[PDB]
Design a protein around this ligand. Structure first.
Ligand SMILES: [Mg+2]
Ligand SMILES: [Mg+2]
Ligand SMILES: [Mg+2]
Ligand SMILES: [Mg+2]
Ligand SMILES: [Mg+2]
Ligand SMILES: [Mg+2]
Ligand SMILES: [Mg+2]
Ligand SMILES: [Mg+2]
Ligand SMILES: [Mg+2]
Ligand SMILES: [Mg+2]
Ligand SMILES: [Mg+2]
Ligand SMILES: [Mg+2]
Ligand SMILES: [Mg+2]
Lengths: 101, 88, 73, 119
RNA sequence: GUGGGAGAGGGUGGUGGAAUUCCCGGAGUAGCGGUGAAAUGCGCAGAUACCGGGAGGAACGCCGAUGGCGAAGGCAGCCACCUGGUCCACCCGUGACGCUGAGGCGCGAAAGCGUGGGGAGCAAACCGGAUUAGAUACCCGGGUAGUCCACGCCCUAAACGAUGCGCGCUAGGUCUCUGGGUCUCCUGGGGGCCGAAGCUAACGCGUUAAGCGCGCCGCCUGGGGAGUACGGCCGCAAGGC
RNA sequence: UUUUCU
């Protein structure tokens, strides 16, 4: 397998119920696709550089998983399905390239 | 891709003796491996012509190695093929 | 004369590969969502090539503008 | 008639005319003018003067609506662009800000022969 | 072989934003557009300019280089997967296993062809306006094939470095891309420039040779007739050899 | 704008 970084941005107008709901479908999603969460970050609402789905804000996530490469694509096929999930970018982990360090 | 595992598995698998990394048998084994992964990858992707040139070179290099092998030890030859699956 | 102060100097160490460090990335854009040339970034062939890629990702994650309106004038 | 007080001043400058559309804080056009709206008919239309007049005019009609403050949005390069701007700066309107917002493709449609060849 | 590295190399899927066009809604009104001037054209069934929403096609701005990758054709939004080549380090393994290559096989820009699909923008032909002594043109308004996708053909080119491939040998200087080291220098791979010797009709070339040498392939033998005629092979055709 | 021949 390999180390991936799953970024997800969803509807910033979700109530604690709705918000915790999508995070559930996400969790099952990752699961049903052999994605083992190594660690997670949740910055929450952030100011977008430009509207995304008419909305001027976004609720960001960040699940660093470890799963089968042969399914990363399929994993996102699913994640993008959620109507509130308006952005899914799965990136291969990469050693940070310092600079002016 | 061929992982370090899968690879060295083959290396030892064909090595002439402890520590044999590049003998005709090993080399031919490794090439055969790649040729198969690649030949496979091209069953799908009939249009990846660039990789196909890779395959063409790989096959050639194998042909040469064997040609030499048979020339030298015709027995090790018959052995290698059979063991592998070449000439087919 | 592209000699004010390369965005590099005016900045501590950082991971050019970080597609979320907006606060830092923002620095490499102009008065528009445009990526500064090297005379500006003060980066280097290899670095700049990364910066760019990174910047694009941020762009997509609605974290960095693709373009901005020019003021003054 | 509605009385808008403050609004936007879109300047569509170009190598062929220049046209001004004053608008409300929501973008809905109040009044507009242009080289043609004024006397001018053809070539003369794109001159920087035909722009000054079109600007002041568009501005006047804007005053009558109650306009006093405006935000300028320049679009396109063309004679009469920076003129239109000065025409406005004057007038009975106050120019709050100036912004260049000309549209530029991130390379999408093939231009007609007239404009091909570059890069 | 082990351990590193850079890359618009390739194939599949997905996906992002800017712009054009069209559509719907708003607000607004008399022109817009176009040129050397104009006119055709579009607009009061309300165009242009401005805001909001939708659809669709095609191409990816900055980064971008005097840069990189590939055998060539040629390749640049972003993501994942699949996949070729290549450089460096260690000196670990095989032990001359090498070079070239008639024929064959494959690849091969654009246009072009067949089947199906798609079609925003552009636009041979074509339909108009204008310019002109004329204008089967250059300029302007429209516009079909096509440009796009898939599958199958075609195989050409200023397919150019107008420079076949491989190896060895022959001052340096300077810039640059990528790797290593005891890293203001040294060492390797690549891209440029100036130049030793030398070569060249000259222009110029000059460790990225067009220098000095060996191996193998391809090709030339005054111009026109003519890349024609004939024959053959190939192609659906155009037409190619 | 265009703008032949000798
Ligand atoms: Mg590789
Ligand atoms: Mg040894
Ligand atoms: Mg020995
Ligand atoms: Mg074509
Ligand atoms: Mg066709
Ligand atoms: Mg047209
Ligand atoms: Mg035309
Ligand atoms: Mg072709
Ligand atoms: Mg060099
Ligand atoms: Mg000399
Ligand atoms: Mg020289
Ligand atoms: Mg003769
Ligand atoms: Mg026939």
């Amino acid at each position: 397998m390999r180390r991936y970084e799953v970024n997800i941005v969803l509807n910033p107008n979700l109530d604690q119920s709705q918000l915790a709901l999508e995070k559930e479908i996400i969790q099952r999603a990752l699961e049903n696709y052999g994605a083992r969460v190594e660690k997670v970050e949740e910055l929450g609402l952030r100011r977008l550089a430009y509207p995304i789905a008419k909305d001027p804000q976004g609720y960001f996530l960040w699940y660093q998983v470890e799963m089968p490469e042969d399914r990363v694509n399929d994993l996102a096929r699913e994640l993008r399905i959620r109507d509130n999930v308006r952005r899914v970018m799965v990136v291969k982990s990469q050693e940070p390239f310092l600079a002016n360090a | 891709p061929i992982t370090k595992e899968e690879k060295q598995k083959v290396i030892q698998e064909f090595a002439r003796f402890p520590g044999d990394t590049g003998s005709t048998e090993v080399q031919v084994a490794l090439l055969t491996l790649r040729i198969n992964r690649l030949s496979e990858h091209l069953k799908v992707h009939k249009k990846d012509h660039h990789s196909h040139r890779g395959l063409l070179m790989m096959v050639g290099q194998r042909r040469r190695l064997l040609r030499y092998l048979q020339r030298e030890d015709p027995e090790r030859y018959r052995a290698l093929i059979e063991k592998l699956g070449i000439r087919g | 004369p592209s000699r004010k102060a390369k965005v590099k100097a005016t900045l501590g160490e950082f991971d050019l590969r970080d597609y979320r460090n907006v606060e830092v990335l923002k620095r490499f854009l102009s008065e528009t969502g445009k990526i500064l040339p090297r005379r500006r970034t003060g980066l280097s062939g290899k670095e700049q090539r990364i910066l760019a890629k990174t910047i694009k990702r941020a762009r997509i994650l609605g974290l960095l503008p693709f373009t901005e309106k020019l003021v003054r004038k | 008639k509605r009385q808008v007080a403050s609004g936007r001043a879109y300047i569509h400058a170009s190598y062929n005319n220049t046209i001004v559309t004053i608008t409300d804080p929501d973008g809905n056009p109040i009044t507009w003018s242009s080289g043609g709206v004024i006397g001018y008919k053809g070539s003369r239309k794109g001159t920087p003067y035909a722009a000054q007049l079109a600007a002041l005019d568009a501005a006047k009609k804007a005053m009558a609506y109650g306009m006093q403050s405006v935000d300028v949005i320049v679009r396109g390069t063309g004679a009469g662009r920076e003129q239109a701007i000065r025409a406005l700066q004057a007038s009975g309107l106050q120019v709050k800000s100036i912004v260049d917002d000309t549209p530029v493709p991130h390379n999408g449609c093939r231009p007609k022969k007239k404009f091909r060849k570059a890069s």
